[model samples]
Target: MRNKIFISHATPEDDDFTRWLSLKLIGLGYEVWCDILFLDKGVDFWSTIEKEIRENTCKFLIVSSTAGNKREGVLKELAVATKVKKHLQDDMFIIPLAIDENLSYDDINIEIVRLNAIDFKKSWAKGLQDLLDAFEKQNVPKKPPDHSKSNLLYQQIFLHDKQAIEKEETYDSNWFPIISFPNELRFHRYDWRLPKQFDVRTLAFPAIRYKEYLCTFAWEYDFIHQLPKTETYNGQESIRISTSDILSGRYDTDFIRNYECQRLIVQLINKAFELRMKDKNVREYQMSKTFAYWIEKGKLEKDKFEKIKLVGKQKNKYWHFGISAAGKLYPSPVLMVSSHIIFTMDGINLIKSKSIQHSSRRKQGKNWWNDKWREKLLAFIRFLSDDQNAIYLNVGSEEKILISNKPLKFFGKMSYVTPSEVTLEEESVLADINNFEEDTEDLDELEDIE
Candidate 1:
């Protein structure tokens, strides 16, 4: 009656893997047994396991890992399986299924190191195929396929979800579509002495330096007047062309190549967006050569921002509205909003955005729910928009770059996870508790009243 496959592993550590392997083996109609599902509390653990291995185990599967290699229970089971293997005179009696990618030959149990083990680290399905092949080649016995076994395991694993519900979940993405672009692009020529280590980002307007000239969308007077105080400039020449021609690279400058022109154009557009944020009084933070924008507590209150409710019951504390790097510049550009939980304590503590995670004082930040994030994003956009419902960046005295007040929205049909009662309550409590903790931790809150 040696037809069953006995599975051994370190208790609790490999319970999830044991459950998965048992489910799959049962689904394929193989007689599989593992202590995680079989042994009840206060059972004769070693006594029953030894009897099962002595009489009925056709194959012994060791779920190998660093923990399994050192565990006393697993080693004792291996010793028992070894005696059975010797009595039957079969080398293939004990099979090891390795799941740890970092476990080496020297790191594994000496008994397992001497034998070949099946790998399940890279892909479980691929490993299972190899295991099934081995079983078939060894003439392992299996009953007819019984899906009821798999169904039972499924219920045991997923306590909350039986199946997915059909619904559409609209996600607010980072992509912002270009409603319109300026018609003309102007390049101003100047004789300038810029420092070898000069930073172009210091300029107030959007511009890029060419080999012997400066490329910009700003008017000549505006460009010259705003030149860095550290540099010397004598403006002389100017060139004007339709923005479409420059974008398509139809009109060629003898020295500038098409790709270079396109790159500069995109760079200028990104810079314009950055300049617009500054004009709107948004605070800047840079990390690893990338820049992010955010609204300060003072700025939010000064402007009378209508999004205090988005912060959830705390008009006194600032949510620290942050905007991610301005993205792709082909058909349209994109940007993302982030919330860094901060309160005014000793002139704003070092608790900052994820972009500067390395520098932030708070190592582990609180979790932000999906709905709360979406609301904050919507509010940040509204705060940035003008009465015309557009964010306008001045390129020239008259010409400007216009951006949509809201992010582009798209609709589609899809299935979404139905939130369980437990998850909903947990999320609500997490928001309230984390906010309360953050508020109390700040010393400045004691002096100020909302």
Candidate 2:
């Protein structure tokens, strides 16, 4: 049986048209039941009808004529149907089919004659069509429509809209270029919004341009593993770390996260860098020498005490495990990207509590990136963050570069930012050395390459 529609009618005069209407409804696909015990044989009279009315039945059709107006059963069914609608909150369950075309409401049972009726005496076809239309209005469509494009995640990622996005947080839970600036923005500085529930943390890489500078800066930190932190102002290094705001947080300065656990971040950083070298495609995306600058190959342990330096220039520069010194040779603006290092929706999009670097278009790889290295770095970050992806919210400043293994994908290709220096001899090797800041004027040659 399909949907059941119970019809309530009385008197022999109206019985003819009531059965006719029921047949029409049956032809249109409803199982119309006219009597209380038609097939229920020996079942309790009222209970069976009420049970079906309250359960299997969908709607009730009330047939009315002059004789039906005086019938006690017709009035009783009307009262019960109306009462059920009151309790079920479905007043549309009852439909009145008045048999006399010109009959007034005074001619039928007052209990239900007030409901809008389907006048059948004139033309049963027109009334049936109207009833069919009404039935369809309450029917559920078999198949639901598709709704996949409702999301505008990472939608507006152009240049001019930077300031506009700096404010909206409805969808961008991963700190994209909107809340981040390559340098100080007249726009907002930061947003610390984090997801209440998270499984991973990340430093979103919204663009490929970030790969060059951050990769370089991260490479050094990833190698050295630790550095002495300091603070200064008004172009002076006179301020000492021992008693200055650098230690107490009065002013701003940066230090390696050695406090959390140097070996942890360092190991992960090196691993990320180590994995990058294996991909020639990744190298091509960076400068022609991305791998050369960071990869220590078989010399990794030996290089920890010895390599990755800048040479073939005026005053030779050198770098070793935790040691750095720069001169005319190693001055390339130190390859940086910052002003704000933020992570939104940490633990989902954020694989690391820290933020990192960028690259170019048409990177020379089969995949956008190696997923294994990604997992290694993120898992390591969770460990270092003391299981918290919000490590940067308090400890590190955007001034000091941070690293994240997870960055957002640009989806489609973006133009290559700039070309990298291709032809160069091997960088000089050094034992142990001191970490020194690069001179801006010394970067004159490097400025051209950027």
Over 167-265, each residue of candidate 2 has an lDDT whose tens digit, in order, gives 222211122111111221111111122122321122321111111112111211221223222111111311213212222234343532224222222
Best by TM-score: 1
Superposition error at 336 for model 1 (Å): 5.3
Q: Mind giving the per-residue lDDT tens digits that candidate 1 earns over 272-316?
A: 777777777666776444566666545545534563442221333
Error of 2 at 163 (Å): 88
Model 1 spans > 4 angstroms off: 1-169, 192-200, 226-237, 248-254, 298-304, 307-319, 333-365, 424-450
What TM-score, over all chains together, does every model reach?
0.52, 0.29
Model 1 whole-model lDDT (C-alpha atoms): 0.68
- Supply the global lDDT for candidate 2: 0.38
